Design a binder for these strands. Sequence first.
RNA 1: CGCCGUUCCGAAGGGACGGGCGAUGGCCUCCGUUGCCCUCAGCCGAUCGAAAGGGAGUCGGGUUCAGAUCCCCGAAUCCG
RNA 2: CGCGACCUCAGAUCAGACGUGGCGACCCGCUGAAUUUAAGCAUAUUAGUCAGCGGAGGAAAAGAAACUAACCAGGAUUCCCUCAGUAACGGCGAGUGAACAGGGAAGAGCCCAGCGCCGAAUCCCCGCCCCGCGGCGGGGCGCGGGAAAUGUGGCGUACGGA
Lengths: 86, 50, 203, 122, 53, 118
Amino acid sequence: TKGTSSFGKRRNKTHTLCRRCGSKAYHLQKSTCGKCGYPAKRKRKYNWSAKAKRRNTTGTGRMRHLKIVYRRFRHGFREGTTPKPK
Amino acid sequence: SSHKTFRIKRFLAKKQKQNRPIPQWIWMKTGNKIRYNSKRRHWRRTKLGL
Amino acid sequence: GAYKYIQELWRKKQSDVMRFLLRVRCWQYRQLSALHRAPRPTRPDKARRLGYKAKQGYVIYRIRVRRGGRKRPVPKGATYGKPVHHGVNQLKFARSLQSVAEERAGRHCGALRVLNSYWVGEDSTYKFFEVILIDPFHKAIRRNPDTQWITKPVHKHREMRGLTSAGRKSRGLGKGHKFHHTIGGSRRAAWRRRNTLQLHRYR
Amino acid sequence: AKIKARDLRGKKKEELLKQLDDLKVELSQLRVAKVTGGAASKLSKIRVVRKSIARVLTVINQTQKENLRKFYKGKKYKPLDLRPKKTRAMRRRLNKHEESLKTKKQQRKERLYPLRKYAVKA
Amino acid sequence: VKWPRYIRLQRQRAILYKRLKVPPAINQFTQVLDRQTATQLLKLAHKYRPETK
Amino acid sequence: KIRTSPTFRRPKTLRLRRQPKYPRKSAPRRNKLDHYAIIKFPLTTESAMKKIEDNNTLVFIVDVKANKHQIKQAVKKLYDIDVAKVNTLIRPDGEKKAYVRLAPDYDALDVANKIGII
RNA sequence: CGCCGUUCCGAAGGGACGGGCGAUGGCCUCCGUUGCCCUCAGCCGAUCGAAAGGGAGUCGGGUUCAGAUCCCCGAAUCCG
RNA sequence: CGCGACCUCAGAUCAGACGUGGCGACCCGCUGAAUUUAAGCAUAUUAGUCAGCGGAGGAAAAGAAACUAACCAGGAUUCCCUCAGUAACGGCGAGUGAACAGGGAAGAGCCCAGCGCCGAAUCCCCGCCCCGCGGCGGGGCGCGGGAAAUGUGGCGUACGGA
Ligand SMILES: [Mg+2]
Ligand SMILES: [Mg+2]
Ligand SMILES: [Mg+2]
Ligand SMILES: [Mg+2]
Ligand SMILES: [Mg+2]
Ligand SMILES: [Mg+2]
Ligand SMILES: [Mg+2]
Ligand SMILES: [Mg+2]
Ligand SMILES: [Mg+2]
Ligand SMILES: [Mg+2]
Ligand SMILES: [Mg+2]
Ligand SMILES: [Mg+2]
Ligand SMILES: [Mg+2]
Ligand SMILES: [Mg+2]
Ligand SMILES: [Mg+2]
Ligand SMILES: [Mg+2]
Ligand SMILES: [Mg+2]
Ligand SMILES: [Mg+2]
Ligand SMILES: [Mg+2]
Ligand SMILES: [Mg+2]
Ligand SMILES: [Mg+2]
Ligand SMILES: [Mg+2]
Ligand SMILES: [Mg+2]
Ligand SMILES: [Mg+2]
Ligand SMILES: [Mg+2]
Ligand SMILES: [Mg+2]
Ligand SMILES: [Mg+2]
Ligand SMILES: [Mg+2]
Ligand SMILES: [Zn+2]
């Protein structure tokens, strides 16, 4: 009865959504993420999975602030000035 | 279930709004290729997983 | 010229005077925590010839490191390999205990820069070292041209990259025929150079 | 009667707050119109009124920051948001004065032994 | 009283200096002037204090 | 002078209040949940009309972050009416619906005409 | 990287009736508030851990296409 | 008993600062296999390599001899050519394996502690005036506070120095 019959007894969730990486790998009883390692301060990451590192590296997301830096670097991070008014 | 967390009830709401057909004026757009919403989901065929 | 007498005095470590001081100080150091901010250098002459200056921004920390070698951290002593790698005891760590002492002071005070360290005592179980650190943002340091070098980002965590005097001794650096391993600046640098195939365009 | 930022530059704060409130009242009415069958003209007005709201808030925020900078010009300590952003690493650099500093031993060396201009006969 | 660790430490260090054998080089400093000589010595020295800032 | 207790406790020491040389934020942040933000638009469905006519109740879509006290104060200020109570639910699509009941001296059917709902 | 450990190598209390000194106030009369001092003080373990355990207090009638011990009508109750 | 110095040690939402996390192609410090080859296999090899941990920067590390040599001598570090699959290591098996000299790329040298002499000649911070102020600094004035003789600053460092 280890097959079809035993598949009907599973109605208790092991993982839920992680508040750091948003992946359903937050083990509830261990209070840890199998994906990002939350609540550890440092992000979980290994070199034996290159594919996994390119799934969530820098660039794969929004780059909300890093992509304005790339624009600001091309002008020397000038601040407190404006183009000559009309 | 009836017993729900706010976070789950909010995730489910977003999955509800994405489950609609494309507007029909999207077809006439100049460089359009989309024919239909290829990301449709059915509660019975495929499960949200959470 | 008192710093001359003290230096000579701290060379007679088996004299009755210094044996008494080392013994009670080791006892006192043993009743404190493994990391402890020291109000002033226990060895003012030794500290200063290692770079310490008695001005604001220089701080002293006493670090206690357990003595002895490195036991391999394998469960039940099983290494799962060939007999050449079965060793569990009698293995030694590549770096000194003084270097470990600086690393533990550098990690704790991450906003400071580790300058150097020195030996202040030991018993069968512990060695005691005092680490000289610098606050790289105190204006007594930033405005002094002769100490501006250590406020540079290139000098973050010297103790963690083998750049301190105690740290760099385990890197096998040095000039001459005894140190061919590190020609190129480091063992890895020498290895890469000696193990890279140069395939010139015209070969 | 469209709202242009240039027209708003010199006005008083309370005068712009009043102007803001009129637009916000207008938008709410349009949002009621959006569901009661307002004409296409009223629907198109929503985006026009929304960006007019943004323009007023922009001029209020800009004018307020301009005066805060004038307020804190001579002050030694300024709010973190009025200090230069640059990058985090650039904010931690030795400033202009600190990099120019030299020990008196180095100043005397440069004075006595300045690099010379010379040529060698062919 | 159960004193803080730092109090226990400095008191137990004063007991050790009595309990152990202190070499004469360190023990010579326990012999000091009496108050009357130190007062005279300090009053004369008071007349040659370095000028303040 | 004497210790009647074998315990030693950390003595209480003066704790000064903060006196910053500068404020970390130059200006206070503007309120982003004002009255016009709380009330998005009125609901005009068949059941909303029944609420207006039979239960003296207006039906609004409101910001999910708003609470009953905020909704009540926003409704009064925006439309200058009095509110008896507020009932709230969060809809399956994420929007928050507010069932606002007006005081007996107010006619929701009349108030709806002022708002433009009817 | 961290791990062990949960009262065990810890100066682990930011509290209180009352009293004393000032500073302020208001239905300025006399009462509040506040700061300091005096005095008194075990709990001895941060925190998390149950939609079946502990845990104050809502019942009747009507009402929808789909909700009601939640809406309306009526009659109550606990807590602050 | 009290008062006052210092020392050692605490508590503050005290004033002002700073560290954390990421990326990680290249770089530095550790730790570190076994497939594999040896026609078996245990030393060896794989390999100081993969995996694992830490720390950076635009480069890093190294670097101005406790050097190479043994010549009529060279002269910091790094890189290229060659030395050289060489001296050497190795069940002396399989395999492994540099350096010096020579030719180029580049080229740059310096500073403390110490020993001494200078009235601490030194440094940080607060207040006020002038300047400048999106790299918070310069000048002036405070019987303003502190650090510092348990040693700051100037001269000076093996090429000798005063
Ligand atoms: Mg489980
Ligand atoms: Mg199913
Ligand atoms: Mg090693
Ligand atoms: Mg060297
Ligand atoms: Mg000098
Ligand atoms: Mg709980
Ligand atoms: Mg419960
Ligand atoms: Mg229960
Ligand atoms: Mg009721
Ligand atoms: Mg503070
Ligand atoms: Mg084989
Ligand atoms: Mg074979
Ligand atoms: Mg085999
Ligand atoms: Mg082997
Ligand atoms: Mg090897
Ligand atoms: Mg690796
Ligand atoms: Mg790492
Ligand atoms: Mg880092
Ligand atoms: Mg960088
Ligand atoms: Mg460097
Ligand atoms: Mg060279
Ligand atoms: Mg040949
Ligand atoms: Mg053989
Ligand atoms: Mg090898
Ligand atoms: Mg050569
Ligand atoms: Mg050249
Ligand atoms: Mg000197
Ligand atoms: Mg030399
Ligand atoms: Zn996660």
